[PDB]
Amino acid sequence: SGSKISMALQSKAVKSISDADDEILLSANEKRWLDEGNGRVLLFQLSGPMIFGVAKAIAREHNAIQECAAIVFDLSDVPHLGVDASLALENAIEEAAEKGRAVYIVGATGQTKRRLEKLQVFRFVPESNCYDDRSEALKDAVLALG
Amino acid sequence: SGSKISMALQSKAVKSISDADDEILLSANEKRWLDEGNGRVLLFQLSGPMIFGVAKAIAREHNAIQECAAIVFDLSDVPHLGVDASLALENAIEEAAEKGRAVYIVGATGQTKRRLEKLQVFRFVPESNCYDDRSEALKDAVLALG
């Protein structure tokens, strides 16, 4: 099912990026011709309303999350964390400390947890802000808003 | 069910961006607490291997598609095209003309087609490169490669 990141401010305000194959529906025949192109043919499938281009859509999302007071990172479904991605996650955590945002981490285990340990994430996230329970983290985040 | 853009070089090399609600799975209880946050709590849901950060993942995909000789835009499922998005589409079509890439357009109808008509598009995409049949466009793109 590949990899996915989803960002949600609200139950009906969800933005996601994915490299899963099933995100597009291709007939066997279509797959046949796409693959025959051997990477030389790029298929853009667009669905639903297309209001803003990619750049401004991204910018609108950036503006939308500037006022978040708490970030919950759910890593339950992450079986492996690369070095670069771990540094990206550390950067977000550090940015959060500089702009005044609380940080919670859910479900880090195995190699993913080991990698985060080496970054010394604990300096910014206390053990009390780590959970195995996503809904408990969300609840605590909300209640600690003020 | 929201909007989605999927890009595919190969049947198993698909990249997608989406604002569909169902891209994340939230229990009713989780939705209740997220929405109680009133946009003040940002949930990051990560799943599958996380190798590179977002920036470098973007750059890797950009490097992967600079080799494309043909671009097929499938607009069958687009019921409305905003002004900015239409200009972003026009820009991609024009970049394609400058870098030597063939352009095909599938399933433009209704307002989406009307907006495209206003936007100079016939100058770059001849009527023979417009299709209602996605598999036929892919086949023709491939066959016209060389």
PDB file of C-alpha atoms in Angstrom:
ATOM      1  CA  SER A   1       0.000   0.000   0.000  1.00  0.00           C
ATOM      2  CA  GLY A   2       3.085   2.199  -0.202  1.00  0.00           C
ATOM      3  CA  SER A   3       3.562   5.319   1.857  1.00  0.00           C
ATOM      4  CA  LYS A   4       1.207   8.109   2.813  1.00  0.00           C
ATOM      5  CA  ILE A   5       1.253  11.330   4.777  1.00  0.00           C
ATOM      6  CA  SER A   6      -2.084  12.861   5.800  1.00  0.00           C
ATOM      7  CA  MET A   7      -2.523  16.200   7.513  1.00  0.00           C
ATOM      8  CA  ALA A   8      -5.756  17.129   9.181  1.00  0.00           C
ATOM      9  CA  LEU A   9      -6.865  20.294  11.008  1.00  0.00           C
ATOM     10  CA  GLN A  10     -10.450  19.101  11.110  1.00  0.00           C
ATOM     11  CA  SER A  11     -12.297  15.890  10.248  1.00  0.00           C
ATOM     12  CA  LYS A  12     -13.286  17.388   6.866  1.00  0.00           C
ATOM     13  CA  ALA A  13     -10.077  19.306   6.206  1.00  0.00           C
ATOM     14  CA  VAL A  14      -7.570  16.609   5.292  1.00  0.00           C
ATOM     15  CA  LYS A  15      -4.592  16.966   2.929  1.00  0.00           C
ATOM     16  CA  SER A  16      -2.627  13.895   1.820  1.00  0.00           C
ATOM     17  CA  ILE A  17       0.326  12.846  -0.298  1.00  0.00           C
ATOM     18  CA  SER A  18       0.749   9.197  -1.283  1.00  0.00           C
ATOM     19  CA  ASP A  19       2.835   6.921  -3.502  1.00  0.00           C
ATOM     20  CA  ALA A  20       0.336   4.083  -3.359  1.00  0.00           C
ATOM     21  CA  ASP A  21      -0.462   2.421  -6.705  1.00  0.00           C
ATOM     22  CA  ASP A  22      -4.165   2.125  -6.039  1.00  0.00           C
ATOM     23  CA  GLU A  23      -4.534   5.927  -5.831  1.00  0.00           C
ATOM     24  CA  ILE A  24      -5.206   5.752  -9.568  1.00  0.00           C
ATOM     25  CA  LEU A  25      -7.535   3.256 -11.237  1.00  0.00           C
ATOM     26  CA  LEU A  26      -6.020   1.801 -14.398  1.00  0.00           C
ATOM     27  CA  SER A  27      -7.423  -0.998 -16.495  1.00  0.00           C
ATOM     28  CA  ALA A  28      -5.036  -3.830 -17.376  1.00  0.00           C
ATOM     29  CA  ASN A  29      -5.027  -2.436 -20.916  1.00  0.00           C
ATOM     30  CA  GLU A  30      -4.128   1.070 -19.704  1.00  0.00           C
ATOM     31  CA  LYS A  31      -1.360  -0.283 -17.421  1.00  0.00           C
ATOM     32  CA  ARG A  32      -0.080  -2.198 -20.445  1.00  0.00           C
ATOM     33  CA  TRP A  33       0.372   0.932 -22.524  1.00  0.00           C
ATOM     34  CA  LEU A  34       1.667   3.105 -19.666  1.00  0.00           C
ATOM     35  CA  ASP A  35       4.330   0.530 -18.871  1.00  0.00           C
ATOM     36  CA  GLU A  36       5.176   0.075 -22.566  1.00  0.00           C
ATOM     37  CA  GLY A  37       6.030   3.788 -22.496  1.00  0.00           C
ATOM     38  CA  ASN A  38       8.812   2.733 -20.105  1.00  0.00           C
ATOM     39  CA  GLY A  39       8.683   5.999 -18.165  1.00  0.00           C
ATOM     40  CA  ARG A  40       8.587   8.152 -21.320  1.00  0.00           C
ATOM     41  CA  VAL A  41       4.854   8.821 -21.020  1.00  0.00           C
ATOM     42  CA  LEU A  42       3.534  10.728 -17.980  1.00  0.00           C
ATOM     43  CA  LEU A  43      -0.133  10.300 -17.052  1.00  0.00           C
ATOM     44  CA  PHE A  44      -1.808  13.087 -15.069  1.00  0.00           C
ATOM     45  CA  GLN A  45      -5.129  11.993 -13.672  1.00  0.00           C
ATOM     46  CA  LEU A  46      -7.228  14.827 -12.193  1.00  0.00           C
ATOM     47  CA  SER A  47     -10.531  14.334 -10.399  1.00  0.00           C
ATOM     48  CA  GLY A  48     -12.978  16.565  -8.549  1.00  0.00           C
ATOM     49  CA  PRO A  49     -12.927  20.387  -8.650  1.00  0.00           C
ATOM     50  CA  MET A  50      -9.593  21.929  -9.644  1.00  0.00           C
ATOM     51  CA  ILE A  51      -9.697  25.434  -8.189  1.00  0.00           C
ATOM     52  CA  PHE A  52      -6.129  26.558  -7.532  1.00  0.00           C
ATOM     53  CA  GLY A  53      -2.907  25.310  -9.040  1.00  0.00           C
ATOM     54  CA  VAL A  54      -0.570  23.128  -6.966  1.00  0.00           C
ATOM     55  CA  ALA A  55       1.663  25.987  -5.818  1.00  0.00           C
ATOM     56  CA  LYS A  56      -1.097  28.231  -4.438  1.00  0.00           C
ATOM     57  CA  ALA A  57      -2.988  25.257  -3.002  1.00  0.00           C
ATOM     58  CA  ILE A  58       0.157  24.396  -1.055  1.00  0.00           C
ATOM     59  CA  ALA A  59       0.527  28.020   0.033  1.00  0.00           C
ATOM     60  CA  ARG A  60      -3.097  28.119   1.221  1.00  0.00           C
ATOM     61  CA  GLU A  61      -2.440  25.015   3.291  1.00  0.00           C
ATOM     62  CA  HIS A  62       0.731  26.539   4.748  1.00  0.00           C
ATOM     63  CA  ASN A  63      -1.224  29.638   5.809  1.00  0.00           C
ATOM     64  CA  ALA A  64      -3.921  27.391   7.312  1.00  0.00           C
ATOM     65  CA  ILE A  65      -1.569  25.624   9.720  1.00  0.00           C
ATOM     66  CA  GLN A  66       0.417  28.664  10.910  1.00  0.00           C
ATOM     67  CA  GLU A  67      -1.971  29.064  13.842  1.00  0.00           C
ATOM     68  CA  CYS A  68      -1.858  25.463  15.085  1.00  0.00           C
ATOM     69  CA  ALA A  69      -0.981  25.290  18.774  1.00  0.00           C
ATOM     70  CA  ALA A  70      -0.388  21.549  18.962  1.00  0.00           C
ATOM     71  CA  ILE A  71       0.965  18.932  16.578  1.00  0.00           C
ATOM     72  CA  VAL A  72       0.234  15.244  16.928  1.00  0.00           C
ATOM     73  CA  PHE A  73       2.581  13.016  14.910  1.00  0.00           C
ATOM     74  CA  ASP A  74       1.124   9.545  14.409  1.00  0.00           C
ATOM     75  CA  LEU A  75       3.818   7.021  13.507  1.00  0.00           C
ATOM     76  CA  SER A  76       1.926   3.828  14.389  1.00  0.00           C
ATOM     77  CA  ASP A  77       1.892   2.642  10.764  1.00  0.00           C
ATOM     78  CA  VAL A  78       5.514   3.529   9.985  1.00  0.00           C
ATOM     79  CA  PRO A  79       7.642   0.341   9.925  1.00  0.00           C
ATOM     80  CA  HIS A  80      10.890   2.073   8.852  1.00  0.00           C
ATOM     81  CA  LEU A  81      12.233   5.595   9.102  1.00  0.00           C
ATOM     82  CA  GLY A  82      14.983   6.760   6.723  1.00  0.00           C
ATOM     83  CA  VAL A  83      17.763   9.103   7.824  1.00  0.00           C
ATOM     84  CA  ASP A  84      16.604  12.095   5.826  1.00  0.00           C
ATOM     85  CA  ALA A  85      12.992  11.717   6.859  1.00  0.00           C
ATOM     86  CA  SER A  86      14.090  11.431  10.496  1.00  0.00           C
ATOM     87  CA  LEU A  87      15.948  14.731  10.143  1.00  0.00           C
ATOM     88  CA  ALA A  88      12.842  16.302   8.541  1.00  0.00           C
ATOM     89  CA  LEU A  89      10.779  15.116  11.490  1.00  0.00           C
ATOM     90  CA  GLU A  90      13.371  16.489  13.909  1.00  0.00           C
ATOM     91  CA  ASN A  91      13.296  19.839  12.131  1.00  0.00           C
ATOM     92  CA  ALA A  92       9.493  20.063  12.442  1.00  0.00           C
ATOM     93  CA  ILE A  93       9.789  19.264  16.146  1.00  0.00           C
ATOM     94  CA  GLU A  94      12.437  21.941  16.588  1.00  0.00           C
ATOM     95  CA  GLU A  95      10.438  24.472  14.631  1.00  0.00           C
ATOM     96  CA  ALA A  96       7.536  23.745  16.957  1.00  0.00           C
ATOM     97  CA  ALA A  97       9.648  24.646  20.018  1.00  0.00           C
ATOM     98  CA  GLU A  98      10.635  27.937  18.438  1.00  0.00           C
ATOM     99  CA  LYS A  99       7.130  29.069  17.431  1.00  0.00           C
ATOM    100  CA  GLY A 100       5.342  27.892  20.592  1.00  0.00           C
ATOM    101  CA  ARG A 101       3.608  24.657  19.540  1.00  0.00           C
ATOM    102  CA  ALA A 102       3.101  21.633  21.753  1.00  0.00           C
ATOM    103  CA  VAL A 103       4.276  18.284  20.334  1.00  0.00           C
ATOM    104  CA  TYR A 104       2.817  14.821  20.808  1.00  0.00           C
ATOM    105  CA  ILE A 105       4.119  11.570  19.306  1.00  0.00           C
ATOM    106  CA  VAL A 106       1.919   8.508  18.832  1.00  0.00           C
ATOM    107  CA  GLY A 107       2.931   4.900  18.242  1.00  0.00           C
ATOM    108  CA  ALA A 108       6.664   5.158  17.542  1.00  0.00           C
ATOM    109  CA  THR A 109       8.037   1.583  17.807  1.00  0.00           C
ATOM    110  CA  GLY A 110      10.847  -0.631  16.508  1.00  0.00           C
ATOM    111  CA  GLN A 111      13.404   0.886  14.156  1.00  0.00           C
ATOM    112  CA  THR A 112      11.304   4.077  13.837  1.00  0.00           C
ATOM    113  CA  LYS A 113      11.594   4.621  17.598  1.00  0.00           C
ATOM    114  CA  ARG A 114      15.307   3.686  17.675  1.00  0.00           C
ATOM    115  CA  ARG A 115      16.047   6.274  14.977  1.00  0.00           C
ATOM    116  CA  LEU A 116      14.108   8.956  16.837  1.00  0.00           C
ATOM    117  CA  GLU A 117      16.040   8.068  19.984  1.00  0.00           C
ATOM    118  CA  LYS A 118      19.345   8.877  18.314  1.00  0.00           C
ATOM    119  CA  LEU A 119      18.134  12.375  17.443  1.00  0.00           C
ATOM    120  CA  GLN A 120      17.437  12.950  21.126  1.00  0.00           C
ATOM    121  CA  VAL A 121      13.862  13.940  20.444  1.00  0.00           C
ATOM    122  CA  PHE A 122      13.335  13.599  24.199  1.00  0.00           C
ATOM    123  CA  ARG A 123      14.897  17.085  24.628  1.00  0.00           C
ATOM    124  CA  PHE A 124      11.749  18.546  23.037  1.00  0.00           C
ATOM    125  CA  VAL A 125       9.172  15.862  23.769  1.00  0.00           C
ATOM    126  CA  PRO A 126       8.734  14.554  27.301  1.00  0.00           C
ATOM    127  CA  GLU A 127       7.698  10.912  27.824  1.00  0.00           C
ATOM    128  CA  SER A 128       4.306  12.149  28.992  1.00  0.00           C
ATOM    129  CA  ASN A 129       3.718  13.450  25.440  1.00  0.00           C
ATOM    130  CA  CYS A 130       4.309  10.036  23.875  1.00  0.00           C
ATOM    131  CA  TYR A 131       1.286   7.728  23.442  1.00  0.00           C
ATOM    132  CA  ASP A 132       0.222   4.390  21.952  1.00  0.00           C
ATOM    133  CA  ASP A 133      -3.330   5.670  21.885  1.00  0.00           C
ATOM    134  CA  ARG A 134      -4.135   8.186  19.158  1.00  0.00           C
ATOM    135  CA  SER A 135      -7.441   9.398  20.553  1.00  0.00           C
ATOM    136  CA  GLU A 136      -5.918   9.888  23.996  1.00  0.00           C
ATOM    137  CA  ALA A 137      -3.200  12.138  22.465  1.00  0.00           C
ATOM    138  CA  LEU A 138      -5.764  14.188  20.523  1.00  0.00           C
ATOM    139  CA  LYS A 139      -7.866  14.590  23.645  1.00  0.00           C
ATOM    140  CA  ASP A 140      -4.881  15.651  25.761  1.00  0.00           C
ATOM    141  CA  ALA A 141      -3.751  18.092  23.042  1.00  0.00           C
ATOM    142  CA  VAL A 142      -7.153  19.723  22.963  1.00  0.00           C
ATOM    143  CA  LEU A 143      -7.448  19.911  26.734  1.00  0.00           C
ATOM    144  CA  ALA A 144      -3.959  21.471  27.048  1.00  0.00           C
ATOM    145  CA  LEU A 145      -4.864  24.289  24.613  1.00  0.00           C
ATOM    146  CA  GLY A 146      -6.152  26.532  27.379  1.00  0.00           C
TER     147      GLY A 146
ATOM    148  CA  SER B   1     -15.239  12.905  -2.373  1.00  0.00           C
ATOM    149  CA  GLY B   2     -12.885  15.854  -2.828  1.00  0.00           C
ATOM    150  CA  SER B   3     -10.142  16.539  -5.335  1.00  0.00           C
ATOM    151  CA  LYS B   4      -7.146  14.479  -6.359  1.00  0.00           C
ATOM    152  CA  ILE B   5      -4.186  14.719  -8.692  1.00  0.00           C
ATOM    153  CA  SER B   6      -2.342  11.504  -9.560  1.00  0.00           C
ATOM    154  CA  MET B   7       0.837  11.283 -11.579  1.00  0.00           C
ATOM    155  CA  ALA B   8       2.129   8.043 -12.950  1.00  0.00           C
ATOM    156  CA  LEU B   9       5.215   7.179 -15.029  1.00  0.00           C
ATOM    157  CA  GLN B  10       4.541   3.482 -14.668  1.00  0.00           C
ATOM    158  CA  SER B  11       1.686   1.388 -13.240  1.00  0.00           C
ATOM    159  CA  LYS B  12       3.649   0.992  -9.985  1.00  0.00           C
ATOM    160  CA  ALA B  13       5.163   4.462  -9.907  1.00  0.00           C
ATOM    161  CA  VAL B  14       2.230   6.634  -8.889  1.00  0.00           C
ATOM    162  CA  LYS B  15       2.355   9.894  -6.898  1.00  0.00           C
ATOM    163  CA  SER B  16      -0.827  11.537  -5.647  1.00  0.00           C
ATOM    164  CA  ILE B  17      -2.047  14.589  -3.778  1.00  0.00           C
ATOM    165  CA  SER B  18      -5.587  14.641  -2.402  1.00  0.00           C
ATOM    166  CA  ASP B  19      -7.920  16.609  -0.134  1.00  0.00           C
ATOM    167  CA  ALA B  20     -10.374  13.755   0.273  1.00  0.00           C
ATOM    168  CA  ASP B  21     -11.611  13.208   3.852  1.00  0.00           C
ATOM    169  CA  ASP B  22     -11.409   9.443   3.623  1.00  0.00           C
ATOM    170  CA  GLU B  23      -7.635   9.460   2.991  1.00  0.00           C
ATOM    171  CA  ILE B  24      -7.311   9.246   6.757  1.00  0.00           C
ATOM    172  CA  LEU B  25      -9.277   6.847   8.947  1.00  0.00           C
ATOM    173  CA  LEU B  26     -10.650   8.462  12.081  1.00  0.00           C
ATOM    174  CA  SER B  27     -12.990   6.923  14.605  1.00  0.00           C
ATOM    175  CA  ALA B  28     -16.007   9.063  15.539  1.00  0.00           C
ATOM    176  CA  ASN B  29     -14.313   9.630  18.907  1.00  0.00           C
ATOM    177  CA  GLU B  30     -11.117  10.843  17.198  1.00  0.00           C
ATOM    178  CA  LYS B  31     -13.094  13.151  14.867  1.00  0.00           C
ATOM    179  CA  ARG B  32     -14.872  14.585  17.910  1.00  0.00           C
ATOM    180  CA  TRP B  33     -11.633  15.573  19.613  1.00  0.00           C
ATOM    181  CA  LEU B  34      -9.930  16.830  16.424  1.00  0.00           C
ATOM    182  CA  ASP B  35     -12.929  19.040  15.635  1.00  0.00           C
ATOM    183  CA  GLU B  36     -13.118  20.217  19.258  1.00  0.00           C
ATOM    184  CA  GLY B  37      -9.600  21.512  18.631  1.00  0.00           C
ATOM    185  CA  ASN B  38     -11.263  23.981  16.243  1.00  0.00           C
ATOM    186  CA  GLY B  39      -8.283  23.866  13.894  1.00  0.00           C
ATOM    187  CA  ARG B  40      -5.799  24.471  16.742  1.00  0.00           C
ATOM    188  CA  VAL B  41      -4.630  20.843  16.728  1.00  0.00           C
ATOM    189  CA  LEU B  42      -2.870  19.481  13.657  1.00  0.00           C
ATOM    190  CA  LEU B  43      -2.798  15.698  13.213  1.00  0.00           C
ATOM    191  CA  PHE B  44      -0.016  14.170  11.097  1.00  0.00           C
ATOM    192  CA  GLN B  45      -0.869  10.650  10.072  1.00  0.00           C
ATOM    193  CA  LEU B  46       2.139   8.778   8.608  1.00  0.00           C
ATOM    194  CA  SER B  47       1.986   5.268   7.206  1.00  0.00           C
ATOM    195  CA  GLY B  48       4.319   2.967   5.278  1.00  0.00           C
ATOM    196  CA  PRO B  49       8.105   3.425   5.054  1.00  0.00           C
ATOM    197  CA  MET B  50       9.288   7.024   5.489  1.00  0.00           C
ATOM    198  CA  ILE B  51      12.589   7.285   3.645  1.00  0.00           C
ATOM    199  CA  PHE B  52      13.122  10.881   2.507  1.00  0.00           C
ATOM    200  CA  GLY B  53      11.578  14.067   3.806  1.00  0.00           C
ATOM    201  CA  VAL B  54       8.918  15.845   1.755  1.00  0.00           C
ATOM    202  CA  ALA B  55      11.302  18.299   0.065  1.00  0.00           C
ATOM    203  CA  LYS B  56      13.718  15.655  -1.232  1.00  0.00           C
ATOM    204  CA  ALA B  57      10.842  13.334  -2.151  1.00  0.00           C
ATOM    205  CA  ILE B  58       9.481  16.191  -4.275  1.00  0.00           C
ATOM    206  CA  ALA B  59      12.861  16.762  -5.892  1.00  0.00           C
ATOM    207  CA  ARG B  60      13.283  13.046  -6.631  1.00  0.00           C
ATOM    208  CA  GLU B  61       9.931  13.056  -8.415  1.00  0.00           C
ATOM    209  CA  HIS B  62      10.824  16.214 -10.340  1.00  0.00           C
ATOM    210  CA  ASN B  63      14.061  14.534 -11.447  1.00  0.00           C
ATOM    211  CA  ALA B  64      12.106  11.434 -12.490  1.00  0.00           C
ATOM    212  CA  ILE B  65       9.737  13.286 -14.835  1.00  0.00           C
ATOM    213  CA  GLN B  66      12.167  15.562 -16.699  1.00  0.00           C
ATOM    214  CA  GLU B  67      12.755  12.611 -19.024  1.00  0.00           C
ATOM    215  CA  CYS B  68       9.140  12.422 -20.181  1.00  0.00           C
ATOM    216  CA  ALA B  69       8.520  12.755 -23.898  1.00  0.00           C
ATOM    217  CA  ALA B  70       4.743  12.766 -23.676  1.00  0.00           C
ATOM    218  CA  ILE B  71       2.188  14.045 -21.187  1.00  0.00           C
ATOM    219  CA  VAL B  72      -1.404  12.853 -21.043  1.00  0.00           C
ATOM    220  CA  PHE B  73      -3.764  15.090 -19.046  1.00  0.00           C
ATOM    221  CA  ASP B  74      -6.902  13.221 -17.997  1.00  0.00           C
ATOM    222  CA  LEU B  75      -9.651  15.675 -17.070  1.00  0.00           C
ATOM    223  CA  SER B  76     -12.622  13.290 -17.380  1.00  0.00           C
ATOM    224  CA  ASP B  77     -13.442  13.536 -13.662  1.00  0.00           C
ATOM    225  CA  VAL B  78     -12.985  17.296 -13.334  1.00  0.00           C
ATOM    226  CA  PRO B  79     -16.447  18.951 -13.089  1.00  0.00           C
ATOM    227  CA  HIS B  80     -15.110  22.508 -12.614  1.00  0.00           C
ATOM    228  CA  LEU B  81     -11.832  24.245 -13.380  1.00  0.00           C
ATOM    229  CA  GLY B  82     -10.877  27.387 -11.416  1.00  0.00           C
ATOM    230  CA  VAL B  83      -9.053  30.300 -13.046  1.00  0.00           C
ATOM    231  CA  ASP B  84      -5.721  29.783 -11.318  1.00  0.00           C
ATOM    232  CA  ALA B  85      -5.697  26.069 -11.951  1.00  0.00           C
ATOM    233  CA  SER B  86      -6.515  26.678 -15.617  1.00  0.00           C
ATOM    234  CA  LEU B  87      -3.520  29.013 -15.832  1.00  0.00           C
ATOM    235  CA  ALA B  88      -1.322  26.377 -14.112  1.00  0.00           C
ATOM    236  CA  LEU B  89      -2.524  23.862 -16.719  1.00  0.00           C
ATOM    237  CA  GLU B  90      -1.751  26.325 -19.506  1.00  0.00           C
ATOM    238  CA  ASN B  91       1.739  26.876 -18.117  1.00  0.00           C
ATOM    239  CA  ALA B  92       2.479  23.127 -18.084  1.00  0.00           C
ATOM    240  CA  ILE B  93       1.251  22.849 -21.669  1.00  0.00           C
ATOM    241  CA  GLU B  94       3.520  25.735 -22.659  1.00  0.00           C
ATOM    242  CA  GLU B  95       6.551  24.371 -20.817  1.00  0.00           C
ATOM    243  CA  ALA B  96       5.938  21.124 -22.745  1.00  0.00           C
ATOM    244  CA  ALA B  97       6.162  23.071 -26.027  1.00  0.00           C
ATOM    245  CA  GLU B  98       9.452  24.593 -24.959  1.00  0.00           C
ATOM    246  CA  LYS B  99      11.172  21.406 -23.749  1.00  0.00           C
ATOM    247  CA  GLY B 100       9.966  19.110 -26.548  1.00  0.00           C
ATOM    248  CA  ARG B 101       7.138  17.086 -25.000  1.00  0.00           C
ATOM    249  CA  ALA B 102       4.014  15.985 -26.787  1.00  0.00           C
ATOM    250  CA  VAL B 103       0.704  16.842 -25.108  1.00  0.00           C
ATOM    251  CA  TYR B 104      -2.535  14.853 -25.054  1.00  0.00           C
ATOM    252  CA  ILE B 105      -5.777  15.897 -23.367  1.00  0.00           C
ATOM    253  CA  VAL B 106      -8.466  13.398 -22.341  1.00  0.00           C
ATOM    254  CA  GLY B 107     -12.098  13.934 -21.391  1.00  0.00           C
ATOM    255  CA  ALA B 108     -12.297  17.723 -21.138  1.00  0.00           C
ATOM    256  CA  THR B 109     -16.033  18.584 -21.103  1.00  0.00           C
ATOM    257  CA  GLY B 110     -18.477  21.179 -19.785  1.00  0.00           C
ATOM    258  CA  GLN B 111     -17.137  24.222 -17.953  1.00  0.00           C
ATOM    259  CA  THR B 112     -13.656  22.642 -17.807  1.00  0.00           C
ATOM    260  CA  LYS B 113     -13.514  22.557 -21.603  1.00  0.00           C
ATOM    261  CA  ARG B 114     -15.025  26.047 -21.931  1.00  0.00           C
ATOM    262  CA  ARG B 115     -12.333  27.471 -19.636  1.00  0.00           C
ATOM    263  CA  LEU B 116      -9.622  25.692 -21.612  1.00  0.00           C
ATOM    264  CA  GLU B 117     -11.002  27.136 -24.862  1.00  0.00           C
ATOM    265  CA  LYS B 118     -10.622  30.658 -23.537  1.00  0.00           C
ATOM    266  CA  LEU B 119      -7.044  29.840 -22.639  1.00  0.00           C
ATOM    267  CA  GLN B 120      -5.208  29.726 -25.945  1.00  0.00           C
ATOM    268  CA  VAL B 121      -4.975  25.943 -25.730  1.00  0.00           C
ATOM    269  CA  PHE B 122      -5.642  24.950 -29.351  1.00  0.00           C
ATOM    270  CA  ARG B 123      -2.330  26.660 -30.244  1.00  0.00           C
ATOM    271  CA  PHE B 124      -0.412  23.785 -28.611  1.00  0.00           C
ATOM    272  CA  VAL B 125      -2.774  20.836 -28.648  1.00  0.00           C
ATOM    273  CA  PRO B 126      -4.297  19.942 -32.015  1.00  0.00           C
ATOM    274  CA  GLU B 127      -7.782  18.370 -32.079  1.00  0.00           C
ATOM    275  CA  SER B 128      -6.192  15.052 -33.007  1.00  0.00           C
ATOM    276  CA  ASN B 129      -4.523  15.080 -29.553  1.00  0.00           C
ATOM    277  CA  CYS B 130      -7.830  15.372 -27.687  1.00  0.00           C
ATOM    278  CA  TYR B 131      -9.601  12.148 -26.710  1.00  0.00           C
ATOM    279  CA  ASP B 132     -12.551  10.853 -24.717  1.00  0.00           C
ATOM    280  CA  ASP B 133     -10.813   7.481 -24.533  1.00  0.00           C
ATOM    281  CA  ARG B 134      -7.956   7.348 -22.020  1.00  0.00           C
ATOM    282  CA  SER B 135      -6.429   4.059 -23.172  1.00  0.00           C
ATOM    283  CA  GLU B 136      -6.441   5.254 -26.770  1.00  0.00           C
ATOM    284  CA  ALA B 137      -4.509   8.426 -25.793  1.00  0.00           C
ATOM    285  CA  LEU B 138      -1.917   6.360 -23.901  1.00  0.00           C
ATOM    286  CA  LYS B 139      -1.508   3.981 -26.809  1.00  0.00           C
ATOM    287  CA  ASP B 140      -1.147   6.859 -29.276  1.00  0.00           C
ATOM    288  CA  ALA B 141       1.368   8.640 -27.014  1.00  0.00           C
ATOM    289  CA  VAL B 142       3.464   5.508 -26.788  1.00  0.00           C
ATOM    290  CA  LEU B 143       3.270   4.750 -30.502  1.00  0.00           C
ATOM    291  CA  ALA B 144       4.269   8.314 -31.366  1.00  0.00           C
ATOM    292  CA  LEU B 145       7.414   8.113 -29.178  1.00  0.00           C
ATOM    293  CA  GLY B 146       9.658   6.878 -31.962  1.00  0.00           C
TER     294      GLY B 146
END
